[PDB]
């Protein structure tokens, strides 16, 4: 009953094929079925296509929009900051207030460095772990996504998963299965003091959603501590979504370097690296680890981020978002439970994902066994119901403050009905 | 007669020492004398400190603000775009119009990919040159700045100029002197078909300002063409500053991959890579060279960039900016010419820099011979005159549209008077 990609979108779609590689500026955007819809504007829980169709947004730009689109509070803060100019080339005030608030939640007494993307952030964290330890090796886990830079575009043979990445760079990155304590202990017994740092997502969000095993978390902290390797918690997604204290507070764990992003920018380009004074002091202009950026601590990003965190402390964002995701899971379960089809749903607060054909998903290997065809059809049916979920089973479904009342009702009805349609396909 | 860093700035300065490494979020910001001033807001040609002092901005965030601060046209475009939401997670309309306009000026019939910083942009261009050719080596020039990523944090022994950068990565980058035809031809005769690409700034902006020799430019195009290596013109600064067609149109040259940034974002986080369909088609989701980004083609950046380019085509920005820089050069020359002090001033349109103690600066080595102490004192005196120039002699002085009338008068008077003071110091 809804046509997300209409004739206006069709025109733009054929038109951008000549302007951008693959027709888009980011891979995941091209997978939308039957073809990408173009957005005219966004507000609250909705995206509005150039043709006019209104769509409930369960993607939220893949994490940043926990407050929904064009949040009134953040909008007003940004409007006010805008009247003061948006770029200075020197220190501003908002960056100071945001740093203090962020550090108060993720690394009290530590320091922070603001960058412009999660990619720049994890890239900076890695260079920092190498500079601090004097080691080269970085350990990452299969299924974890850390951005668009050489060091993390690697898989176990360490070989490049993208072209243009020298074999020499790829060899310096190790890879083992997520949640695999056995393998984790083995790789450390195999490389020991040559490992500079261990980067990991406390909760995987780029291979569907996958919660961590308590033993995996404990092993990570213990092994990095005993070997001298820095534990890098990539909280670009988990930061400020799993509560104000993020993954560290949620799972009661500690990281040496905390990578932040998306939510802390209020919807504007952002990335950040936080750590103790001992580690952070290595960054230029204080130490030898280089990091610079024309847009670092961009005034508008700072202002939007501060307002966003302010809203997270004053509004029932976490409860509302948790309830929305819970309601979606219950709706999907109510329909699927009336079948003989195996499946599983992983959910951590406001982030979740459905996996068809398997009863358990505790790692990327299992996540990859899920029925892709079923999911893709589900994605398409949902759009036809006016609901937008990631076009890929390996992405995640995110809920936010606006997912309540009518918007939630539409999403829930859409999910029930889309499942039934796909089930009877 | 002006105190840029007052008591409000002093408080913030001591306060941020505990929040950020070196007290700032980007190295160059810490060099401001006697210590960094904090900005409350910016408008037109001015920056306003938290204490209140108004300062003429000859830094302009180091390039992006060719239209000055809070340009009315760009402001209104951004306000309107803001009301439509600032982040979608799917394609928007502004990105399409900006891509078409940019490509029409720098690579007709080609493609483009929007990223979030110049660093991400040059990093993407390099990975693209390596993926396209299947080669590893990248040639850069001494004094050129390409961002905060491993591959370009290198110098000739290729060794790392920053900590945390593996020797293996650094060895894959070659470095020779800027404008040195002899050395350029030699390195190609030494590495030949192993070179994936040659990255260079058509006009150096991060070792003072240094124009290119016509022979250097010709050799670059010829050698890359004959060896199969891609010529990567880093126009993050030159793009849209040296005319709408940038360096290519200004010097009548051609690059395989054009790196863009700063101005194309209208003051918001941005970066871009442009090239022919043959090369660009390698980027994901079309090809194997990976590049993704949550904020790629950010709606506000797109809207601000489009409005900015629109202003560049409709307003006398280039003539006004050229005249301002010319007036500053004449004022500095009028004072210095009445002395027996050797010096030289390099200027290309709206970008320039003064070099004391040397009669010529055609490369970074010479630029490094300039009197740093004189410059630093000049920087401080200027601030005391209410004018802001880079605190480092290796940075550049940029002029923009607002540099006219009273603002220009203040800058010119400040320069004359600051020179005299330093000369009599
Ligand atoms: C030529 C060039 N390339 C890359 C960069 C880095 O741009 P960004 O700081 O946005 O990463 C700069 C900024 N100094 C630059 O001038
Ligand atoms: C955990 C994680 N790290 C890094 C990134 C990349 O962030 P960005 O796209 O802004 O570079 C993402 C975004 N998918 C992420 O989820
Ligand atoms: Cl929005
Ligand atoms: Cl501004």
Is B240 in contact with B208 (CB distance < 8 Å)? no
In a shared domain, residues B205 and B257: yes
Chain A hits for B82, CB-CB cut-off 8 Å, are 70, 75, 78-79, 82
- If residue A105 lies in a helix (H) or strand (E), which one and from where to where? helix A94-106
Identity of the residue in B50, B69, B297 whose CB atom sits nearest the CB atom of A93 = B50
Q: Which atom of ligand 2 is nearest to the CA of A271?
A: 10
Residues B147 and B163 occupy one common structural domain: yes
Pairing type for strands B137-142 and B351-356 reads unpaired
Q: Which two tokens stand for residue B109?
A: 């019939």
A342–chain B nearest CA distance, Å:
31
Whether residue A395 sits in one domain with residue A301: no
Distance CA B225, CA B216 (A): 14
Taking the C-alpha atoms of residue B94 and residue B309, their distance in angstroms, rounded to an integer, is 12
Query: Do both B218 and B298 map to the same domain?
Result: yes
Residues B66 and B195 in one domain: no
Measured from the Cα of B63, ligand 1's closest atom is 16
| Elucidated via | X-ray
Look up the CATH number of the domain holding residue A131. Answer: 3.40.640.10
Q: Which of B315, B343, B362 is the last residue of a domain?
A: B315
Instruction: Give the CB-side neighbour count of residue B179, counting CA atoms within 13 A.
Output: 16
Considering the domain architecture, whether residues A40 and A127 belong to the same structural domain is answered as no
Contact A91, A229 (CB under 8 A): no
Tell me how close the Cα of B208 comes to any Cα of chain A, in angstroms: 17
CA torsion through residues A321, A327, A330, A334, sign: negative
- The pair of three-digit structure tokens given for residue A265, joined into one six-digit string: 């920018």
Q: Tokens for B205? A: 């902006």
In angstroms, the CA B150 to CA B162 distance is 8
Name all residues whose Cβ lies below 6 A of ligand 2. A 62, 117-119, 122, 145-148, 201, 205-206, 234, 236-237, 261; B 293-295
Q: Between A and B, how many residue pairs show a Cβ–Cβ distance under 8 A?
A: 392
Give the structural domain span for A364.
1-71+316-425
Kindly identify which residue of chain A lies nearest to residue B8, measuring between CA atoms: A93
Q: Show residues of chain B in contact with A206, CB under 8 Å.
A: none
Q: Which two tokens stand for residue B379?
A: 């920087």
Q: Which residues' Cβ are closer than 6 Å to ligand 1? A: A 293-295; B 62, 117-119, 122, 145-148, 201, 205-206, 234, 236-237, 261
Pocket test for ligand 2, best of A126, A237, A266, A293 (most atoms within 8 A of CB): A237
As a residue count, chain B comes to 425
What is the number of domains present in chain A? 2
One domain, residues A183 and A281: yes
Residue B68 zone, left/alpha/beta (φ > 0; ψ -120 to 50; rest)? left
Cβ–Cβ below 8 Å for A290 and B119: no
Resolution given for this structure, in angstroms: 2.3
Residue A134 Cα, gap to closest chain B Cα (Å) = 7
User: Which residue of chain A has the CA closest to B100?
Assistant: A19
- Please tell me whether residues A207 and A350 are part of one structural domain: no
Separation CA B335–CA A343 (nearest Å): 80
Q: What's the CATH code of the domain at B419?
A: 3.90.1150.10
Ligand (nearest to CA of B292): 2
Buried/exposed A227-261: b ≥16 CB within 10 Å, e otherwise: bebbbbbbbbbbbbbbbbebbbebbebebbbbbbb
The answer on B200 and B123 residing in a single domain is yes
Report the alpha-carbon distance of residue A348 to residue A211 in Å, rounded.
7
DSSP-based three-state secondary structure for B201: coil
Please check whether residues A378 and A340 belong to one and the same domain: yes
Same-domain status, B96 and B135: yes
Q: What's the CA gap between B158 and B156, in Å, rounded? A: 5
Q: What are the backbone angles phi and psi of residue A349, rounded to the nearest 5°?
A: 60, -110
Cβ within 8 Å, pair A150-B131 = no
Same domain, A295 and A359: no
Of B275, B299, B315, the domain-final residue: B315
Give the number of the ligand closest to the Cα of residue B199.
Answer: 1
Distance (Å, whole) CA B162 – CA B170: 10
Contact B93, A12 (CB under 8 A): yes
Ligand 2, atom nearest to B294 Cα? 9
Three-class secondary structure of residue B337 per DSSP: coil
Of A31, A21, A164, A24, nearest in space to B281 by CA: A21
Distance of CA A381 to the CA centre of its chain: 24
Q: Tokens standing for B330? A: 């004449």
Task: For a ligand 1 pocket test, name from A294, A295, A297 the mutation site with the most ligand atoms within 8 angstroms of its C-beta.
Answer: A294
Residues of B in contact with A171 (CB under 8 A): 168
The domain boundary, picked from B315, B346, B367, lies at B315
For residue A273, the chain B residues in CB contact (below 8 A) are none
């Amino acid at each position: 009953d809804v046509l997300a990609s209409g004739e206006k979108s069709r025109m733009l779609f054929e038109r951008t094929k000549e302007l951008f590689p693959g027709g888009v500026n980011s891979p995941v955007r091209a997978a939308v079925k039957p073809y990408p819809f173009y957005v005219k504007r966004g507000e609250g829980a909705y995206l509005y296509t150039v043709d006019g169709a209104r769509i409930v947004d369960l993607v939220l730009a893949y994490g940043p929009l926990i407050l929904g689109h064009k949040h009134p509070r953040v909008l007003e803060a940004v409007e006010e900051a805008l009247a003061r100019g948006w770029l200075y080339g020197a220190p501003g005030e908002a960056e100071v207030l945001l740093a203090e608030k962020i550090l108060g939640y993720v690394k009290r007494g530590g320091m922070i460095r603001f960058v412009n993307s999660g990619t720049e952030a994890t890239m900076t964290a890695i260079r920092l772990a190498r500079g601090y330890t004097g080691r080269d090796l970085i350990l990452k886990f299969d299924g974890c996504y850390h951005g668009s830079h050489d060091a993390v575009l690697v898989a176990a043979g360490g070989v490049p998963t993208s072209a243009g990445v020298p074999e020499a760079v790829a060899r310096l990155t190790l890879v083992t299965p997520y949640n695999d304590v056995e393998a984790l202990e083995r790789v450390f017994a195999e490389y020991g003091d040559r490992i500079a740092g261990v980067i990991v997502e406390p909760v995987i969000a780029n291979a569907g959603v996958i919660p961590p095993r308590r033993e995996f978390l404990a092993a990570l902290q213990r092994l990095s501590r005993e070997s001298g390797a820095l534990l890098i918690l990539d909280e670009v997604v988990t930061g400020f979504r799993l509560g104000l204290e993020g993954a560290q507070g949620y799972f009661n764990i500690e990281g040496d370097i905390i990578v932040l992003g998306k939510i802390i920018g209020g919807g504007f380009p952002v990335g950040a690296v936080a750590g103790s004074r001992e580690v952070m002091s290595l960054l230029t202009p204080q130490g030898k680890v280089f990091n610079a950026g024309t847009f670092n601590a961009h005034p508008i990003t700072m202002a939007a981020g501060l307002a966003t965190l302010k809203a997270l402390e004053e509004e029932p964002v976490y409860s509302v978002s948790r309830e929305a995701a819970k309601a979606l899971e219950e709706a999907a379960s109510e329909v699927l439970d009336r079948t003989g089809l195996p499946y599983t749903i992983n959910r951590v607060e406001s982030m979740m994902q459905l996996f068809i054909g398997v009863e358990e998903v505790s790692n990327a290997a299992q996540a990859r066994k899920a029925d892709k065809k079923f999911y893709v059809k589900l994605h398409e049916e949902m759009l036809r119901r006016g609901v937008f979920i990631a076009p890929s089973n390996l992405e995640a479904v995110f809920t936010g403050l606006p997912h309540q009342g009518e918007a939630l009702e539409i999403a829930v009805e859409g999910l029930r009905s889309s499942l039934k349609t796909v089930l009877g396909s």
